[PDB]
Design a protein around this motif. Structure first.
Motif, PDB file in Angstrom:
ATOM      1  N   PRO A   1      -8.118   0.045   9.130  1.00 29.12           N
ATOM      2  CA  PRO A   1      -6.679   0.714   8.892  1.00 29.12           C
ATOM      3  C   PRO A   1      -6.085   0.381   7.855  1.00 29.12           C
ATOM      4  CG  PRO A   1      -6.845  -1.575  10.252  1.00 29.12           C
ATOM      5  CD  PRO A   1      -8.445  -1.218   9.842  1.00 29.12           C
ATOM      6  N   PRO A   4      -0.496  -3.453   5.374  1.00 27.25           N
ATOM      7  CA  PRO A   4       0.584  -3.655   5.672  1.00 27.25           C
ATOM      8  C   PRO A   4       1.663  -3.087   4.672  1.00 27.25           C
ATOM      9  CG  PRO A   4       0.107  -5.749   4.716  1.00 27.25           C
ATOM     10  CD  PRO A   4      -1.201  -4.864   5.027  1.00 27.25           C
ATOM     11  N   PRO A   7       6.483  -5.796  -0.146  1.00 28.07           N
ATOM     12  CA  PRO A   7       7.590  -6.672  -0.013  1.00 28.07           C
ATOM     13  C   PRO A   7       8.789  -5.813  -0.440  1.00 28.07           C
ATOM     14  CG  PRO A   7       6.460  -7.307  -1.910  1.00 28.07           C
ATOM     15  CD  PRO A   7       5.528  -6.217  -1.386  1.00 28.07           C
TER      16      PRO A   7
ATOM     17  N   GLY B   1      -9.920  -0.581   4.919  1.00 32.19           N
ATOM     18  CA  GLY B   1      -8.978   0.349   4.709  1.00 32.19           C
ATOM     19  C   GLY B   1      -8.047   0.685   3.489  1.00 32.19           C
ATOM     20  N   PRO B   2      -7.252   1.779   3.464  1.00 36.97           N
ATOM     21  CA  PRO B   2      -6.471   2.092   2.298  1.00 36.97           C
ATOM     22  C   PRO B   2      -5.196   1.186   2.317  1.00 36.97           C
ATOM     23  CG  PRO B   2      -5.946   3.552   4.247  1.00 36.97           C
ATOM     24  CD  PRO B   2      -6.988   2.632   4.819  1.00 36.97           C
ATOM     25  N   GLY B   4      -1.494  -0.170   1.961  1.00 34.73           N
ATOM     26  CA  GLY B   4      -0.247  -0.050   2.929  1.00 34.73           C
ATOM     27  C   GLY B   4       0.878   0.847   2.254  1.00 34.73           C
ATOM     28  N   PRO B   5       1.901   1.060   2.610  1.00 35.39           N
ATOM     29  CA  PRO B   5       2.850   1.816   1.731  1.00 35.39           C
ATOM     30  C   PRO B   5       3.901   1.064   1.151  1.00 35.39           C
ATOM     31  CG  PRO B   5       3.603   1.714   4.138  1.00 35.39           C
ATOM     32  CD  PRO B   5       2.561   1.124   3.969  1.00 35.39           C
TER      33      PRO B   5
ATOM     34  N   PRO C   1      -8.477  -4.271   7.488  1.00 31.72           N
ATOM     35  CA  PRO C   1      -7.390  -3.482   7.153  1.00 31.72           C
ATOM     36  C   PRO C   1      -7.401  -3.699   5.653  1.00 31.72           C
ATOM     37  CG  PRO C   1      -6.792  -5.087   8.770  1.00 31.72           C
ATOM     38  CD  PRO C   1      -8.292  -5.493   8.518  1.00 31.72           C
ATOM     39  N   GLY C   2      -6.413  -2.443   4.980  1.00 31.10           N
ATOM     40  CA  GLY C   2      -6.506  -2.627   3.569  1.00 31.10           C
ATOM     41  C   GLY C   2      -5.713  -3.514   3.021  1.00 31.10           C
ATOM     42  N   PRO C   3      -5.319  -3.836   1.603  1.00 33.03           N
ATOM     43  CA  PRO C   3      -4.330  -4.483   1.083  1.00 33.03           C
ATOM     44  C   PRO C   3      -2.820  -4.303   1.365  1.00 33.03           C
ATOM     45  CG  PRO C   3      -5.463  -3.215  -0.520  1.00 33.03           C
ATOM     46  CD  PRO C   3      -5.934  -2.655   0.654  1.00 33.03           C
ATOM     47  N   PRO C   4      -2.024  -4.945   1.056  1.00 36.51           N
ATOM     48  CA  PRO C   4      -0.438  -4.775   1.211  1.00 36.51           C
ATOM     49  C   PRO C   4      -0.230  -3.621   0.257  1.00 36.51           C
ATOM     50  CG  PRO C   4      -0.976  -6.876   1.051  1.00 36.51           C
ATOM     51  CD  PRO C   4      -2.049  -6.416   0.771  1.00 36.51           C
ATOM     52  N   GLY C   5       0.754  -2.877   0.401  1.00 37.15           N
ATOM     53  CA  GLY C   5       1.484  -1.736  -0.116  1.00 37.15           C
ATOM     54  C   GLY C   5       2.317  -2.473  -1.431  1.00 37.15           C
ATOM     55  N   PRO C   6       2.594  -1.823  -2.579  1.00 42.82           N
ATOM     56  CA  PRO C   6       3.367  -2.135  -3.699  1.00 42.82           C
ATOM     57  C   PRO C   6       4.843  -2.676  -3.273  1.00 42.82           C
ATOM     58  CG  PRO C   6       3.294   0.175  -3.702  1.00 42.82           C
ATOM     59  CD  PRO C   6       2.540  -0.338  -2.493  1.00 42.82           C
ATOM     60  N   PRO C   7       5.500  -3.366  -4.114  1.00 46.06           N
ATOM     61  CA  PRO C   7       6.951  -3.820  -3.867  1.00 46.06           C
ATOM     62  C   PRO C   7       7.661  -2.632  -3.800  1.00 46.06           C
ATOM     63  CG  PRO C   7       6.034  -5.301  -5.317  1.00 46.06           C
ATOM     64  CD  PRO C   7       4.835  -4.273  -5.230  1.00 46.06           C
TER      65      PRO C   7
END
Lengths: 7, 7, 7
Positions: A1, A4, A7, B1-2, B4-5, C1-7
């Protein structure tokens, strides 16, 4: 998936 | 996965 | 799950 939201 | 946003 | 999104 997809990871997250950033920040 | 891809990545996050943007926060 | 994928990595966190950017700030």
């Amino acid at each position: 998936p997809p990871g997250p939201p950033g920040p």
